[PDB]
């Protein structure tokens, strides 16, 4: 007698208990994020504590159920997911030491502070330093802030990160993974699916192959941006060298978005900002979200539940409380779907409403799944589904069709090439940054980097992979990786690279089924019912099927392809190729701003 039946009954218990418990927890989390008081912090904490204790209970129930004898794939997947036990494998002492280290690092990051020689005032990342790195054109305050961050804060995290790698390497080797990097890569693992499988190292191989296919586009973006920044900082930049890490738009060069002002190809053509016309036509938050609803419904997607319209916070409360205004899409469960957003009447918040309501659409589609499979196929699917909506909604065709733009309104390639260049500064710019960050973390966990070469490798890989040189020599007393929110606080990073590639596979596929003519960026998916149906045949899956199968359900391809990304950017590609006809493409890795 196969205990499969016992595991069936156990999962039937788990679904129904966890439903109410996670509903409690999500509701208390909401009430803190909608009221934000000490009472509400306490209620949210108690709800989450009951929920987390329920997991420490039920994961350890599920450990017994041997996955091997579960031939109803769903069951095996629910049990596998619940049996991802992580830190419970470690000794209680070491679980506590690692939680101690993680809390230390996270609070160091969120509370670190560096001091002006200027004002003797001691700034911080989110207030002062980020405004410096995003809005400053002075070479020297950007260098000051960059370096002071990596020194006052990065140095304190260094031994914490060493012991962190140590303990989580043990924590991974306890769950039969080869290292913590393999543990994280265990997200994309697919097993027991003839023709649809996916090993944990094929993520390595696919990421490397597709980044190789990305390299030329990035090299020409890099040459062009180096040229413009050399025009805006001549004595500091080499025409052939890497980019000084502190001059890249934010504290890390993660996104080059804040460089657009210096790198805009056509500096005098009108940028599409419909925020003025929305204010001109007496639109409010209700109107923005109604229009997003209409967009989705045009594509044969369901309407928002009235509980959504009754329970979502779409305006600055400005009544009796304060709110964490970070736009979030909530799936509390039991058919309750909500959106937090302190919405302004702006084109940015308009597209953001489309993005968050796309998260909502993904949630509502797979609500018929068993909780444990109520999620994106893998970690990057959700945000890609969110991003393709903003793509389809920022297009002239859409903006005209909703009447937020003139019916005669056209758009001049200059305008279009400006838009593509901005899109590349944000999207293409983060791809090598992210690939190399995660490659360095992965190798550190694998052991391929000795502790005493920890940064020496990092910056070599900044010179080699991302074409970015540090402006000051850094010894192992630093830990400039950990200087990013994600590394200091233990998050897998490859999700952004995979999400980027997924969103363009998706948007290309849906624009094909839409019967879209012309270049792929302007494609609207509105009114393309067929595109929405092709998309739903993936959304309703959740993670009940392998992510290779979920991807095939949209793009007909079982794996990750940059050809849709390259097709999206081919006009800007052919633009950079002829701009750079009097420039050096690539980078020598030996030039540094500090050989003087």
């Amino acid at each position: 007698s196969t205990t499969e039946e016992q595991a069936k009954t156990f999962l039937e218990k788990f679904n129904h208990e966890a439903e109410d418990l996670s509903y409690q927890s999500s509701l208390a989390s909401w009430n803190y994020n909608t009221n934000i008081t000490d009472e509400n912090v306490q209620k949210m904490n108690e709800a989450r504590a009951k929920w987390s204790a329920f997991y420490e209970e039920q994961s350890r129930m599920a450990k017994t159920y041997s996955l091997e004898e579960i031939q109803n794939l769903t069951l095996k997947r629910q049990l596998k997911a619940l049996q991802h036990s992580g830190t419970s494998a470690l000794s209680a002492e070491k679980s506590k030491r690692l939680n101690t280290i993680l809390n230390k690092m996270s609070t160091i990051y969120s509370t670190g502070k560096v001091l002006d020689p200027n004002t003797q005032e001691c700034l911080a990342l989110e207030p002062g330093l980020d405004d410096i790195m995003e809005n400053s054109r002075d070479y020297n305050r950007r260098l000051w802030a960059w370096e002071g961050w990596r020194a006052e804060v990065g140095k304190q995290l260094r031994p914490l990160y060493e012991e962190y790698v140590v303990l989580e390497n043990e924590m991974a080797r306890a769950n039969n993974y080869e290292d913590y990097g393999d543990y994280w890569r265990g997200d994309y693992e697919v097993t027991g699916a003839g023709d649809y499988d996916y090993s944990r190292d094929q993520l390595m191989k696919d990421v490397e192959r597709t980044f190789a296919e990305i390299k030329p586009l990035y090299e020409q973006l890099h040459a062009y941006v180096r040229a413009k920044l050399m025009h805006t900082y001549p004595s500091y930049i080499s025409p052939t060298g890497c980019l000084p890490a502190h001059l890249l738009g934010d504290m890390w060069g993660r996104f080059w978005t804040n460089l657009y002002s210096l790198t805009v190809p056509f500096e005098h053509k009108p940028s599409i900002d419909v925020t003025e016309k929305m204010e001109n036509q007496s639109w409010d938050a209700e109107r923005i979200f109604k229009e997003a609803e209409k967009f989705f419904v045009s594509i044969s997607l369901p309407y928002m539940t009235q509980g959504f319209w009754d329970n979502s916070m779409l305006t600055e409360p400005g009544d009796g409380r304060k709110v964490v205004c970070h736009p979030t899409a909530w799936d509390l469960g039991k058919g309750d779907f909500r959106i937090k957003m302190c919405t302004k009447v702006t084109m940015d918040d308009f597209l953001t409403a489309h993005h968050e309501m796309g998260h909502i659409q993904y949630d509502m589609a797979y609500a018929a799944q068993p909780y444990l499979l109520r999620n994106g196929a893998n970690e990057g699917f959700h945000e890609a589904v969110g991003e393709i909506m903003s793509l389809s909604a920022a297009t002239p065709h859409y903006l005209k069709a909703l009447g937020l733009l003139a019916p005669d309104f056209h758009e001049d390639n200059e305008t279009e090439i400006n838009f593509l260049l901005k899109q590349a500064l944000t999207i293409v710019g983060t791809l090598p940054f992210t690939y190399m960050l995660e490659k360095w973390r992965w190798m550190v966990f694998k052991g391929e980097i000795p502790k005493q070469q920890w940064m020496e490798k990092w910056w070599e890989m900044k010179r080699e992979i991302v074409g970015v040189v540090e402006p000051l020599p850094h010894d192992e007393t630093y830990c400039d990786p950990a200087c990013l929110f994600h590394v200091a606080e233990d998050y897998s990073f490859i999700r952004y690279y995979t999400r980027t590639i997924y969103q363009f596979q998706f948007h290309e596929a849906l624009c094909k089924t839409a019967k879209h003519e012309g270049a792929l960026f302007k494609c609207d998916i509105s009114n393309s019912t067929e595109a929405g149906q092709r998309l739903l045949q993936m959304l309703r899956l959740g993670k009940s099927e392998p992510w290779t199968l979920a991807l095939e359900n949209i793009v007909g391809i079982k794996t990750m392809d940059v050809k849709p990304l390259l097709n999206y950017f081919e006009p800007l590609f052919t633009w950079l190729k002829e701009q750079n006809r009097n420039s050096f493409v690539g980078w020598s890795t030996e030039w540094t701003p500090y050989s003087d």
């Binding site: 016992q6 218990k13 129904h16 509903y23 409690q24 017994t64 039991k334």
Partner: protein, 192 residues
């Protein structure tokens, strides 16, 4: 007059696993008013249209009232399967009555959760028609005895519906009254 007001307008309904039965006898019933109330999201009769059973006489009537999620209201019908149909309230294949049902979100849902209503999640076998099982014996799923306690392969057979005034329509509370009409050799005391 028949006391349908106390079956339908009852202040609180029973949990579906202890479904309430009221016997109806020796009274005149007007069923046309129960339907033309137009306040029932479900009023589906598998015996005869509500028209003739105002023009008809039965020996006993049975009003079975309880509460179940809207998505589960499809199970209160002959020939259906699911949790509620197998382990709570079963209608026979030759069922000759009506199923009436309305949305009780304004009554059975409250902020923070209304855990008053239960339902049976596991059972050894399926119910016969019009059977009621209200035992709280821990469901043994594996082969080790439970010793009357929840644990490994050992679960309480009853779980609580969470009726919130924010749930989706299908996870909202619904009040159901199933009307059964019988004929015997005894004279018919229920007419209209």
């Amino acid at each position: 007059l028949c006391p349908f007001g106390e079956v339908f307008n009852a202040t609180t309904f029973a949990s579906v696993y202890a479904w309430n039965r009221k016997r109806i006898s020796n009274c005149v019933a007007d069923y046309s008013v129960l339907y033309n109330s137009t306040s029932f999201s479900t009023f589906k009769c598998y015996g005869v249209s509500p028209t003739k059973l105002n023009d008809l006489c039965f020996t006993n009537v049975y009003a079975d009232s309880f509460v179940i999620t809207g998505d589960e209201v499809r199970q209160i019908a002959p020939g259906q399967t699911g949790k509620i149909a197998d382990y709570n309230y079963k209608l026979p294949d030759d069922f000759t009555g009506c199923v009436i049902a309305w949305n009780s979100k304004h009554i059975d849902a409250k902020e923070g959760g209304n855990f008053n209503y239960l339902y049976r999640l596991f059972r050894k076998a399926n119910l016969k028609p019009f059977e009621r099982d209200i035992s709280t014996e821990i469901y043994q799923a594996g082969s080790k005895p439970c010793n009357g306690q929840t644990g490994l392969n050992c679960y309480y057979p009853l779980y609580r519906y969470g009726f919130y005034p924010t749930d989706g329509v299908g996870h909202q509370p619904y009040r159901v009254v199933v009307l059964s009409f019988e004929l015997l050799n005894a004279p018919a005391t229920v007419c209209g």
